[PDB]
């Protein structure tokens, strides 16, 4: 109002905003960062569902990222880029429910399809402000309207005493839902089309996307979904009400909080850091790829277990894109499996492999664990250290990601959904993790968001072209529900995943290759046999 | 009279017969008695040595076949009839046969002793596929084969009783082995170089002689073709043998052990055979009612226990399998399988078939088998399901037991050689979907393709000669490799480390590693736990 462009001044339901003009390699983009979408969930509102942001007066400055939700900070490899890139990059606070919007500059004069990013982090970490989630490239190159929101993690987002009024659980997912409702009402002010909203997320964010697919009140808030290396089904994304209650009760005892009302009231008096300092002490077994406070089967947000909901759900008018990276498990081994480190080749003995299986499959009986060991052992070389190391990675990746994804894709396809499946096989030339980890969990994200287009990041030219291809796949799917370009038949086609043919594509520097069966043989072990075994 | 055909053994004089092989004559001494006829009160009893005889005993023709069930699945079909008795049935059946080079061997010659198979309920040494003609003529071997009692007559047991102690059919084999030690030198054979070889139940028999101390002094090397003493069909516990014997007695109207066996001895042979199959505890295939029993005597413990703790240092063993061990048995009980159609089966038929092929499996173990063998890219393809049904039966009953035995023998001192036989005879009468069925390597080991009237291909003739050389080289030296040939390539010993075996087909030897390693880990390591826990 005076000297402000004014292509950066926008009004939303809550009031006026002032965004910022950012520089992307190919031109400018508009960014509206740190938009509050909820009342600060602090004090008496800790553990409570979010309340919509009450209107503010004057022009709110939306030129910088807001606080990151309070969370545990990783210190396994202090100062190491491979881990620090995921750590908070803004102040930790319980006052953290803000979202961000990237659009073309000038804003589009025509309703534009919207992408909503939901970050992962095992439901205990993450932030929409991380560099790998920078929406400026998708906004500039593909003309997308990209939105990303913070949501409460850890105890603050998922500590639950099911049935209580003061800690009903799943409030972190309700934070996400409120952001989705904010987009429905307000994204038109930015040139976005609320009738074309695609959710995409990775790890716990993909599991979050799946929970919105499975929760009725969320289905009216989006039209398509992308689940990258994560699912609502599987062994880590949810807990039962009984397990959530015992974990919340134990944590309370561990911070000096011995009726649900009095217990939660006492928890609300504790400092945020006190809860973070003990949240990892409530897991029932020594484990990797397990997180203390995750979505709970409350019979409300989730009317039943994700397994039961995907086994019996109707997904006719639903298009979904799902996939995995080549080495889903390797990242998690250095966080608790003896013998595994980023600083050596991590060749392990057979004994270390058996011990690792008990940690990677913590819920397994002795017989189930033995079944795993026999299945993954190479009986031509049962003691080879290199194969055992790679087998340990496959156990963790198959159990937690690949086979849950394969299960989800199969059920969704059988029950009306249009599914596209991929495996991501390119290892970034810039990767700082060792070679034995291969293509680890989470390292497709930087290519989807188009970071290789930033010339200062020293990616290769082939990786730049590769990123543009993936951006086109993702935005084409967002636009049409089909990753294939409407008129580019020269390039090979990406067929839908079906129960009959089970076709998926490999994403690497070569053109698309069609393959059949997402670890079909191995995932029969995890998804068909092992349930029968454990229940006996 | 021909003096090459006159032989004096400890019992008396024998007269053999000059037979014609493709390349020249051989001396055949057929139907030599090695035991007193196990008839009347000697039914179910251990064998006794044959009493001496006067004059010259005629040994020019095969003797009777031990009384046994006769197959009627495909009447008149060559594929089944080639295994049926080709001489009259009789309980008076304990005779053996000797083939030698004509003239007699000038120096002591290694001896090959054949033990026929047939599920311990059938078989005979007089079958055309066991013709010692060619091995004697071409390789100069002294070949011996004996009849042993089968079915109830050979293995009905009331363990602990005096009148039916069990395993008498194996004692028949052992007595023939003793006869060879005592007499084979009169034929030019070397009793200090005796090699046992057998197929199916015959191979299991060979293995039990390895695991029974009194037998170990009677041979020096062993070949086990598509059979093992360990595994789910070759032995039964004392309690199960007692159950099956008592049930058969009930079915034939009988009636303490003495009184029971006394009434069984009054029954005509066919009465017992008529109810032989009615005592199995489950509907099944590749299961036989009366087999060797873990008596604590002939077998001091289970074959599994004995191979796990035995000392096999100075032992050489040759083992192997055919490409499609299970196909033969499917047409004998599994719905959806016939020699006359391609036997394309549904998935439901596959689950039903698995309960018959793994009769002892719980519902959960059966599910484990189904899920392991299903191709989850084509879970309902009938061709794959049919071939998977054959693989289940073959792996469960032969391939993995063999891999188990080979590993334990190698680990505990034995020199082991392993093979897979992958050639389908041009003359085979079974359908193509059966592949290389159980038992159809034998005609090549014995050298039948060297007979031009049988219309084998000239490549199969050359192939047979190769196999006869492997087997006789192993008999001579404990090593199947030709000590004159140079890297064709070499047949390496099987070891727990490298797990090397060779493919036997029309192409030169190809060394491979791991005998269905992943699948036999399932059968040999996991499934016992799954059942040892229910
Ligand atoms: C954003 O998420 C990821 C990104 C890259 C690799 C792993 C994860 N996933 C988790 S949970 N990272 C936190 C550390 N934990 C393994 C203990
Ligand atoms: C001599 O042995 C064989 C030779 C060829 C194929 C199978 C067998 N084995 C058995 S047991 N044949 C009897 C019939 N059985 C299917 C019940």
UniProtKB/Swiss-Prot annotation, chain A:
Biological-process GO terms, alphabetical: acetylcholine catabolic process; acetylcholine receptor signaling pathway; cell adhesion; osteoblast development; positive regulation of cold-induced thermogenesis; receptor internalization; regulation of receptor recycling; retina development in camera-type eye
Tissue distribution: Predominates in most expressing tissues except erythrocytes where a glycophospholipid-attached form of ACHE predominates.
Pfam families cross-referenced by the UniProt entry: AChE_tetra, COesterase
Cellular localisation: Synapse; Secreted; Cell membrane
Statement: the UniProt record of this protein carries the keyword Glycoprotein: yes
Subunit structure: Isoform H generates GPI-anchored dimers; disulfide linked. Isoform T generates multiple structures, ranging from monomers and dimers to collagen-tailed and hydrophobic-tailed forms, in which catalytic tetramers are associated with anchoring proteins that attach them to the basal lamina or to cell membranes. In the collagen-tailed forms, isoform T subunits are associated with a specific collagen, COLQ, which triggers the formation of isoform T tetramers, from monomers and dimers. Interacts with PRIMA1.
Misc note: Synapses usually contain asymmetric molecules of cholinesterase, with a collagen-like part disulfide-bonded to the catalytic part. A different, globular type of cholinesterase occurs on the outer surfaces of cell membranes, including those of erythrocytes.
Protein name: Acetylcholinesterase
Source organism (scientific name): Mus musculus (Mouse)
Curated annotation (Swiss-Prot), chain B:
Subcellular location(s) per record: Synapse; Secreted; Cell membrane
Disulphide bridges, residue numbers: 66-93, 254-263, 400-520
Protein name: Acetylcholinesterase
Gene3D superfamilies, per database record: alpha/beta hydrolase (3.40.50.1820)
Topological category with respect to the lipid bilayer: Peripheral membrane protein
Function: Terminates signal transduction at the neuromuscular junction by rapid hydrolysis of the acetylcholine released into the synaptic cleft.
Reaction(s) catalysed by this chain's protein: acetylcholine + H2O = choline + acetate + H(+)
Active site (catalytic residues): 200, 325, 438
Family per similarity comment: Belongs to the type-B carboxylesterase/lipase family.
Source organism superkingdom: Eukaryota
Phylogenetic lineage: Eukaryota, Metazoa, Chordata, Craniata, Vertebrata
GO molecular function: acetylcholine binding; acetylcholinesterase activity; collagen binding; identical protein binding; laminin binding; protein homodimerization activity; serine hydrolase activity
EC identifiers of the protein: 3.1.1.7
InterPro entries according to UniProt: AB_hydrolase_fold, AChE-related_enzymes, AChE_tetra, CarbesteraseB, Carboxylesterase_B_AS, Carboxylesterase_B_CS, Cholinesterase
Glycan-linked positions: 256, 341, 455
Summary of subunit composition and partner proteins: Isoform H generates GPI-anchored dimers; disulfide linked. Isoform T generates multiple structures, ranging from monomers and dimers to collagen-tailed and hydrophobic-tailed forms, in which catalytic tetramers are associated with anchoring proteins that attach them to the basal lamina or to cell membranes. In the collagen-tailed forms, isoform T subunits are associated with a specific collagen, COLQ, which triggers the formation of isoform T tetramers, from monomers and dimers. Interacts with PRIMA1.
Top-level EC class: hydrolase
Organism: Mus musculus (Mouse)
Tissue: Predominates in most expressing tissues except erythrocytes where a glycophospholipid-attached form of ACHE predominates.
Keywords tagged on the record: Cell membrane, Disulfide bond, Glycoprotein, GPI-anchor, Hydrolase, Lipoprotein, Membrane, Neurotransmitter degradation, Secreted, Serine esterase, Signal, Synapse
GO BP, sorted A to Z: acetylcholine catabolic process; acetylcholine receptor signaling pathway; cell adhesion; osteoblast development; positive regulation of cold-induced thermogenesis; receptor internalization; regulation of receptor recycling; retina development in camera-type eye
Note: Synapses usually contain asymmetric molecules of cholinesterase, with a collagen-like part disulfide-bonded to the catalytic part. A different, globular type of cholinesterase occurs on the outer surfaces of cell membranes, including those of erythrocytes.
